[PDB]
Amino acid sequence: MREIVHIQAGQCGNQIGAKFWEVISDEHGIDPTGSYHGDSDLQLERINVYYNEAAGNKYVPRAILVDLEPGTMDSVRSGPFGQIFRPDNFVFGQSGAGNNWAKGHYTEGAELVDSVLDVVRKESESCDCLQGFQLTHSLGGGTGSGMGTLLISKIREEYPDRIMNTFSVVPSPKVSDTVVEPYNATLSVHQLVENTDETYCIDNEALYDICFRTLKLTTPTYGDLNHLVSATMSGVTTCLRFPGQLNADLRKLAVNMVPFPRLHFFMPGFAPLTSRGSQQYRALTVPELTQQMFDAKNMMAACDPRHGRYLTVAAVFRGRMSMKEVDEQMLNVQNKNSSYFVEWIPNNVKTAVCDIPPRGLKMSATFIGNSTAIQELFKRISEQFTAMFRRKAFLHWYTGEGMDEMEFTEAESNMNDLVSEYQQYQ
């Protein structure tokens, strides 16, 4: 019931997605062989949301792998739980966008995606009660962004009544990637806005800082950044995995998180998020979760809430917490920090509670929300982009693929509109 299909848009999606599945598999008691050997029926009651049931009492990750890099394919085939994952879902072409979104959307992506979609259709036709899709991709990358954007548009046309939940890596102020990152991001954002219902932005600098400083992992490798991202994704999916005092769902979040259709971007974080030595200096009570959840510096974003306004916050808790305990803390926060919440809503905090904690924590919680601080993302993309674009830097990469400059004009304008709405609510 309320099944989800996942898409791993290239290496971005595969590294994040792979960790997601390692975590989720552990949460459901799923062995490296795929067979279930867990502790409770609760692990099976909703396992079909994320896995395909099979003989041997096996649960196969319900995901599709998409890229133009066969090296990635082999790398994924060689990884953990690879023996479980259905071989039919390795949808890899052999070329690569070359960091050219148009090539990755209009041309190479255009051919690849119809193969991917035939797979998506077969996967969706294997579901009984499909609720939606969850896809992880980057904005400014090549094949990942191209295919991500392209699949989201085509999937939306085929499944207009399903949820489109997008997680993505977005441009940073210092730690950049491709030479045309701002072009690719500009093009991608424009196309994504009209098709995505819910999305979470990922700033690598924040992940690096949380690992470096918060977790005191002063060597914040990609594997550690994946912990933070997969932990968030896992957090978001709690409602489709385990029950509690206040049951919830993704549709409830949409109805109570997006007051206006364009305000669907999220800047997530979670708690407890500590190091190892620090385990001797903590108290896993709701007030602790609360302080971390509403800590502007604990979010996986450069979009520091102290420079914006919260438009809507969702506080999702896991573990046997007291509801008076939780309610008073949420109220205390809004009263103390009222200057940071939008005046349009006479309650800016949504609460949901799962009685089952994540493995290893007495208590935990996930904090997500939409804030006017988000405009910093779009301003960075726009400034980086407009500066390069006005010099027609790399323009030949796009016009050579048939892209009209008009496409960029429209995309830049779109981001200005996203910013304008954040400003209207601030």
Binding site: P243, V255, V258, M323
Partner: protein, 428 residues
């Protein structure tokens, strides 16, 4: 011979429902599997040799709510037909809950309710546990009230409705659901109770010494009131006031049918050894604003009608004195249009608490139910929350997009204004 069928709708309706059934089961000694080692048929129909089954239907769109029920300790008690869900939640959106997807199980609920009704000989009516604003607890409530009005009509339509609190809430579109829920409710209900989640936590921590109460505590206080009000359907008393006698006498005007309530005494095990739990002290406690199940303050309104239901070791002479005592409390303002004093019922059956509970058992208890102008305070606060959200059309697109005309919100608002006016005019 009196019979009652209940509906437990939405997660909360179901959780309260389960609590109410645990208590009803306890009160009569029925075992989890339906065996026992009569008036019992009011709630638990005999079904065959060795077994009785509770007369209820659990309703939602969330498969989870019922799946939890299906694994509970009474899964062997309820017939499987009594647990009904659709496939997708209302997303806390009245449009989905009432018009677009609430439709998925209307027939199934009607099937079960009609079968239960056909099995009754003295159905007094129906008792429903639902929300005053919250997805399927508004949605099905609206759908089922239309149907109960059509299929039964004359049978009692009595409900307990969960009230969003001044501060305690779970979502942000709750005032949209509430204004629509209330508008619909006003055209179908005979009588309903307002139940405030915040007030109930305050009672749990102040009266029962619960440092940090939760839903499992709030539900116990609710079940104490449910029991006392419906106790007279099944248990003998000195003053055998019928449930419909009670409603008839409590409602002087067709539009004033949402009483506020309390319960006394509410004590911890330690307080059980200190409190002077006389009939009069319990009665007096019932009129202190601090003890009410709704965050309203009676000193800002008038008491239109009130009934005191006494239980257990209570002598009518003690009661007459207790009532006389209340009559001297000049601080309690009664409506100028009602010279009539208190309606009093006295049940011989003592109250009970639930093992593993919180409230300590006492020799005497009183359930107080009343209609007052002061309730307008509750409604006004919901309207203030609504006006802000609505004016900004915040999230309105979700209601409209899921199957609603924007204009419906103004229709409801106009009626809420009438609702407030109705309490004011009877106060005046």
């Amino acid at each position: 011979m009196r019979e009652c069928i209940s509906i437990h709708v939405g997660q909360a309706g179901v959780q309260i429902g389960n609590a109410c059934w645990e208590l009803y089961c306890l009160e009569h000694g029925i075992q989890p599997d339906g065996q026992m080692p009569d008036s019992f048929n009011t709630f638990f129909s005999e079904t065959g040799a060795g077994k009785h089954v509770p007369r209820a239907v659990f309703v939602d769109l969330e498969p989870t709510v019922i799946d939890e029920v299906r694994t509970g300790t009474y899964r062997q008690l309820f017939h499987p037909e009594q647990l009904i869900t659709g496939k997708e939640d209302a997303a806390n959106n009245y449009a989905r809950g009432h018009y677009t997807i609430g439709k998925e199980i209307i027939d199934l609920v009607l099937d079960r309710i009609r079968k239960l009704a056909d099995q009754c000989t003295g159905l007094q009516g129906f008792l429903v546990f639902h929300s005053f604003g919250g997805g399927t607890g508004s949605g099905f409530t609206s759908l089922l009230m239309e149907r109960l009005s059509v299929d039964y009509g004359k049978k009692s339509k009595l409900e307990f409705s969960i009230y969003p609190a001044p501060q305690v809430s779970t979502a942000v579109v709750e005032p949209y659901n509430s204004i629509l829920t209330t508008h619909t409710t006003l055209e179908h209900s005979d009588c309903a109770f307002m139940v405030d989640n915040e007030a109930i936590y305050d009672i749990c921590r102040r009266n029962l010494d619960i440092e940090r109460p939760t839903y499992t505590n709030l539900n116990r206080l609710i079940s104490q009131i449910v029991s006392s009000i419906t106790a007279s359907l099944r248990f003998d008393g000195a003053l055998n006031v019928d449930l419909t006698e009670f409603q008839t006498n409590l409602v002087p005007y067709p539009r004033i049918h949402f009483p506020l309530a309390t319960y006394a005494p509410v004590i911890s095990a330690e307080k059980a050894y200190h409190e002077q739990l006389s009939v009069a002290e319990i009665t007096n406690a019932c009129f202190e604003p601090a003890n009410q199940m709704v965050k309203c303050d009676p000193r800002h309104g008038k008491y239109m009608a009130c009934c005191l239901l006494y239980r257990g070791d209570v002598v009518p002479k003690d009661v007459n004195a207790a009532i006389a005592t209340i009559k001297t409390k000049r601080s309690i303002q009664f409506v100028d249009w009602c010279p009539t004093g208190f309606k009093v019922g006295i049940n011989y059956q003592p109250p009970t608490v639930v093992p593993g509970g919180d409230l300590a058992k006492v020799q005497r208890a009183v359930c107080m139910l009343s209609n007052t102008t002061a309730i307008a305070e509750a409604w006004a606060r919901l309207d203030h929350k609504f006006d802000l959200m609505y004016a900004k059309r915040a999230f309105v697109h979700w209601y409209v997009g899921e199957g609603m005309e924007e204009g419906e919100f103004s229709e409801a608002r106009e009626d809420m204004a009438a609702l407030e006016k109705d309490y004011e005019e009877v106060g005046v």
